[PDB]
Design an enzyme around this catalytic site. Structure first.
Site, PDB file in Angstrom:
ATOM      1  N   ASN A 166       0.834  -1.192   0.000  1.00  0.00           N
ATOM      2  CA  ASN A 166       0.000   0.000   0.000  1.00  0.00           C
ATOM      3  C   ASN A 166       0.865   1.237   0.000  1.00  0.00           C
ATOM      4  O   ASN A 166       1.954   1.231   0.578  1.00  0.00           O
ATOM      5  CB  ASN A 166      -0.963   0.014   1.213  1.00  0.00           C
TER       6      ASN A 166
ATOM      7  N   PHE B 127      -1.575   8.234   4.621  1.00  0.00           N
ATOM      8  CA  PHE B 127      -2.424   8.768   5.694  1.00  0.00           C
ATOM      9  C   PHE B 127      -3.667   9.532   5.192  1.00  0.00           C
ATOM     10  O   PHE B 127      -3.866  10.698   5.546  1.00  0.00           O
ATOM     11  CB  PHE B 127      -1.627   9.695   6.653  1.00  0.00           C
TER      12      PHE B 127
ATOM     13  N   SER C 279       5.372   4.819   9.358  1.00  0.00           N
ATOM     14  CA  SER C 279       4.802   4.667   8.005  1.00  0.00           C
ATOM     15  C   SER C 279       5.906   4.831   6.955  1.00  0.00           C
ATOM     16  O   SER C 279       6.674   5.789   7.048  1.00  0.00           O
ATOM     17  CB  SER C 279       3.751   5.735   7.716  1.00  0.00           C
TER      18      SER C 279
ATOM     19  N   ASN D 194       5.148   5.662   3.933  1.00  0.00           N
ATOM     20  CA  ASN D 194       4.442   6.424   2.893  1.00  0.00           C
ATOM     21  C   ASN D 194       4.314   7.937   3.140  1.00  0.00           C
ATOM     22  O   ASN D 194       3.687   8.630   2.335  1.00  0.00           O
ATOM     23  CB  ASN D 194       3.074   5.768   2.633  1.00  0.00           C
ATOM     24  N   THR D 195       4.956   8.446   4.199  1.00  0.00           N
ATOM     25  CA  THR D 195       5.028   9.883   4.497  1.00  0.00           C
ATOM     26  C   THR D 195       6.528  10.207   4.496  1.00  0.00           C
ATOM     27  O   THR D 195       7.242   9.692   5.362  1.00  0.00           O
ATOM     28  CB  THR D 195       4.277  10.255   5.802  1.00  0.00           C
TER      29      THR D 195
ATOM     30  N   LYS E 106       4.836   2.806  17.540  1.00  0.00           N
ATOM     31  CA  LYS E 106       4.785   1.792  16.491  1.00  0.00           C
ATOM     32  C   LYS E 106       6.078   1.907  15.693  1.00  0.00           C
ATOM     33  O   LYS E 106       6.380   2.972  15.146  1.00  0.00           O
ATOM     34  CB  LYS E 106       3.547   1.925  15.595  1.00  0.00           C
TER      35      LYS E 106
ATOM     36  N   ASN F 183       5.344  -2.156  11.878  1.00  0.00           N
ATOM     37  CA  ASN F 183       4.658  -1.611  10.719  1.00  0.00           C
ATOM     38  C   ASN F 183       5.120  -2.427   9.475  1.00  0.00           C
ATOM     39  O   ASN F 183       5.836  -3.430   9.607  1.00  0.00           O
ATOM     40  CB  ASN F 183       4.976  -0.117  10.563  1.00  0.00           C
TER      41      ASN F 183
HETATM   42  C1  FMN Z   1      -3.880  -0.443   3.391  1.00  0.00           C
HETATM   43  C2  FMN Z   1      -3.110  -0.394   4.699  1.00  0.00           C
HETATM   44  C3  FMN Z   1      -3.091   0.790   5.429  1.00  0.00           C
HETATM   45  C4  FMN Z   1      -2.381   0.891   6.637  1.00  0.00           C
HETATM   46  N1  FMN Z   1      -2.455   2.083   7.349  1.00  0.00           N
HETATM   47  C5  FMN Z   1      -1.836   2.150   8.508  1.00  0.00           C
HETATM   48  C6  FMN Z   1      -2.026   3.348   9.328  1.00  0.00           C
HETATM   49  O1  FMN Z   1      -2.707   4.330   9.025  1.00  0.00           O
HETATM   50  N2  FMN Z   1      -1.351   3.313  10.547  1.00  0.00           N
HETATM   51  C7  FMN Z   1      -0.534   2.272  11.000  1.00  0.00           C
HETATM   52  O2  FMN Z   1       0.048   2.393  12.089  1.00  0.00           O
HETATM   53  N3  FMN Z   1      -0.383   1.138  10.236  1.00  0.00           N
HETATM   54  C8  FMN Z   1      -1.011   1.072   9.065  1.00  0.00           C
HETATM   55  N4  FMN Z   1      -0.939  -0.088   8.342  1.00  0.00           N
HETATM   56  C9  FMN Z   1      -0.128  -1.197   8.885  1.00  0.00           C
HETATM   57  C10 FMN Z   1      -0.964  -2.235   9.633  1.00  0.00           C
HETATM   58  O3  FMN Z   1      -1.552  -1.663  10.802  1.00  0.00           O
HETATM   59  C11 FMN Z   1      -0.129  -3.454  10.030  1.00  0.00           C
HETATM   60  O4  FMN Z   1       0.906  -3.045  10.921  1.00  0.00           O
HETATM   61  C12 FMN Z   1       0.494  -4.211   8.856  1.00  0.00           C
HETATM   62  O5  FMN Z   1      -0.477  -4.380   7.822  1.00  0.00           O
HETATM   63  C13 FMN Z   1       1.153  -5.517   9.249  1.00  0.00           C
HETATM   64  O6  FMN Z   1       0.175  -6.437   9.778  1.00  0.00           O
HETATM   65  P1  FMN Z   1      -0.461  -7.603   8.831  1.00  0.00           P
HETATM   66  O7  FMN Z   1       0.703  -8.398   8.316  1.00  0.00           O
HETATM   67  O8  FMN Z   1      -1.303  -8.400   9.763  1.00  0.00           O
HETATM   68  O9  FMN Z   1      -1.311  -6.959   7.725  1.00  0.00           O
HETATM   69  C14 FMN Z   1      -1.651  -0.222   7.105  1.00  0.00           C
HETATM   70  C15 FMN Z   1      -1.670  -1.412   6.373  1.00  0.00           C
HETATM   71  C16 FMN Z   1      -2.388  -1.519   5.180  1.00  0.00           C
HETATM   72  C17 FMN Z   1      -2.362  -2.820   4.420  1.00  0.00           C
HETATM   73  O1  ORO Z   2      -1.279   5.536   5.300  1.00  0.00           O
HETATM   74  C1  ORO Z   2      -0.274   4.775   4.932  1.00  0.00           C
HETATM   75  O2  ORO Z   2       0.268   4.852   3.845  1.00  0.00           O
HETATM   76  C2  ORO Z   2       0.253   3.819   5.921  1.00  0.00           C
HETATM   77  C3  ORO Z   2       0.570   4.153   7.212  1.00  0.00           C
HETATM   78  C4  ORO Z   2       1.380   3.264   7.995  1.00  0.00           C
HETATM   79  O3  ORO Z   2       1.775   3.483   9.147  1.00  0.00           O
HETATM   80  N1  ORO Z   2       1.756   2.087   7.356  1.00  0.00           N
HETATM   81  C5  ORO Z   2       1.431   1.722   6.068  1.00  0.00           C
HETATM   82  O4  ORO Z   2       1.872   0.709   5.544  1.00  0.00           O
HETATM   83  N2  ORO Z   2       0.649   2.607   5.375  1.00  0.00           N
END
Ligand code: FMN
Ligand code: ORO
Ligand code: JBW
Length: 378
Positions: A120, A124, A191, A193-194, A240, A269
């Site tokens: 992804n 944010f 993140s 992505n920022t 995080k 993350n």
């Molecule tokens: C589309 C998407 C958006 C995410 N947005 C955030 C976010 O806003 N804040 C955050 O701390 N992690 C974000 N994450 C990370 C997830 O919270 C998580 O740490 C990560 O997907 C790893 O766990 P998983 O393997 O179970 O998916 C995002 C992940 C995905 C796939």
């Molecule tokens: O908004 C995102 O791009 C985002 C935030 C974050 O903490 N981790 C991630 O994979 N995506």
């Protein structure tokens, strides 16, 4: 719960609908469709009582079961009730920023079903702190009238707007608006992505960030019943972390965490280290799912030892089964967060994983989940 009843999360039609959506519909459209079903309260719900032997805690945070939904799933807190009622004990809303943002150019979410991975580059996208605070207040008022949600926990992940020069200004703004309603605050310095966000994991910068966030939360009490949340206490503070750090960086962070007395660390993350998924070759962003599991478990072991077992851990990264959850727990985690599990396993995610873990705790000879925490290191 009957296998052919629509209220059951294990109802066969959910896996058929999901398999179809995973095959033919854009990733973010699927996600927004799920949130819409959640918003109108049409989702199935868990009707089983959670095992007392799988309960867990982080300080005064009493989790009814060890599974929650990671940040970025319900970014705006638009269907907290519906997601929790699938069988999760908690949810981390956000990441939120002071002003709303549309985020990076779409399409920005891609799934690889074979490897159970997600990439992804969201950046944010959220409605902003003020609108998300309204959403959380509405949930807190609903929770006050519904006994079924009285023990469920809601955390808030906070970050910075893309153009903000100093992150601390944005974190303080979020604390002052939403802090009163959160059970915990997750500081997002990970993140991918920022631009420049991950530079905040440098020891010196991280220490100032943690102390400023803690000072801002402590000032809510000093300046001003006060806590309109589950705990009725000031929110705990979690950090995080990104798994893309060297050993020297991990050790420096651990020393800062011990000195600043952080309440917990979310490990981890998404990663920028995975370059072997064919369907992701020309895609930007962080990778989630099964290819992240080993990296993040190793990172839990390292941090649990670097912090001399003094800092509670929230596991995040490739947890799909009871076996995956137990591995995180024995590595040093107190609780697990799911994200990719909901995407690939569907509605049944929480019901299924809770069953698999209870059986596994029994087979391994544990009286309760608490006895398993950090057992790999015993
Ligand atoms: C589309 C998407 C958006 C995410 N947005 C955030 C976010 O806003 N804040 C955050 O701390 N992690 C974000 N994450 C990370 C997830 O919270 C998580 O740490 C990560 O997907 C790893 O766990 P998983 O393997 O179970 O998916 C995002 C992940 C995905 C796939
Ligand atoms: O908004 C995102 O791009 C985002 C935030 C974050 O903490 N981790 C991630 O994979 N995506
Ligand atoms: C759990 C679930 N169930 C469904 C159904 C059903 N049934 C229909 C459409 C989407 C559904 N979902 C999803 C929720 C989130 C999904 C998703 O693909 N999210 C993006 C970030 C990767 S797919």
């Amino acid at each position: 719960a009957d296998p052919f009843e629509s209220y059951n999360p294990e109802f066969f039609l959910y896996d058929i609908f999901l398999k179809f959506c995973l095959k033919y519909i854009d990733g973010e459209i699927c996600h927004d469709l799920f949130l819409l079903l959640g918003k109108y309260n049409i989702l199935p719900y868990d009707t089983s009582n959670d095992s007392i032997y799988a309960c867990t805690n982080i300080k005064h945070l009493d989790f009814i079961n060890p599974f929650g939904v990671a940040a970025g799933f319900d970014k705006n807190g638009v269907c907290i009730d519906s997601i929790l009622k699938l069988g999760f004990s908690f949810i981390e809303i956000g990441t939120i920023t002071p002003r709303g943002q549309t985020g990076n150019a779409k399409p920005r979410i891609f799934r690889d079903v074979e490897s159970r991975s997600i990439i992804n580059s969201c950046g944010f996208n959220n409605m902003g702190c003020d609108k998300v605070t309204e959403n959380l207040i509405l949930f807190r008022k609903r929770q006050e009238e519904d006994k079924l949600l009285s023990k469920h926990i809601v955390g808030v992940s906070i970050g910075k707007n893309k153009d903000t020069v100093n992150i601390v200004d944005d974190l303080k703004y979020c604390i002052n608006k939403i802090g009163r309603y959160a059970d915990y605050i997750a500081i997002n310095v990970s993140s991918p992505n920022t631009p420049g966000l991950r530079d905040n994991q440098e020891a010196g910068k991280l220490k100032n960030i943690i102390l400023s966030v803690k000072e801002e939360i402590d000032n809510l009490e000093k300046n001003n019943f006060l806590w309109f949340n589950t705990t009725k206490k000031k929110p705990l503070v979690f950090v995080k972390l990104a798994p893309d750090l060297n050993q020297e960086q991990k050790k420096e962070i651990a020393d800062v965490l011990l000195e600043t007395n952080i309440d917990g660390m979310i490990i981890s993350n998404t990663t920028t280290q995975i370059n072997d998924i064919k369907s992701f070759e020309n895609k930007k962003g962080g990778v989630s799912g099964a290819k992240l599991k080993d990296i993040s478990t190793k990172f839990i072991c390292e941090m649990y030892n670097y912090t001399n077992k003094q800092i509670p851990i929230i596991a995040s990264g490739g947890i799909f089964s009871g076996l995956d959850a137990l591995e995180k727990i024995e590595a040093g985690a107190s609780v697990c967060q799911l994200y990719s599990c909901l995407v690939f396993n569907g509605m049944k995610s929480a019901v299924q994983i809770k069953r698999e873990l209870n059986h596994l705790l029994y087979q391994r000879g544990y009286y309760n989940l608490k006895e398993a925490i950090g057992r790999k290191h015993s």
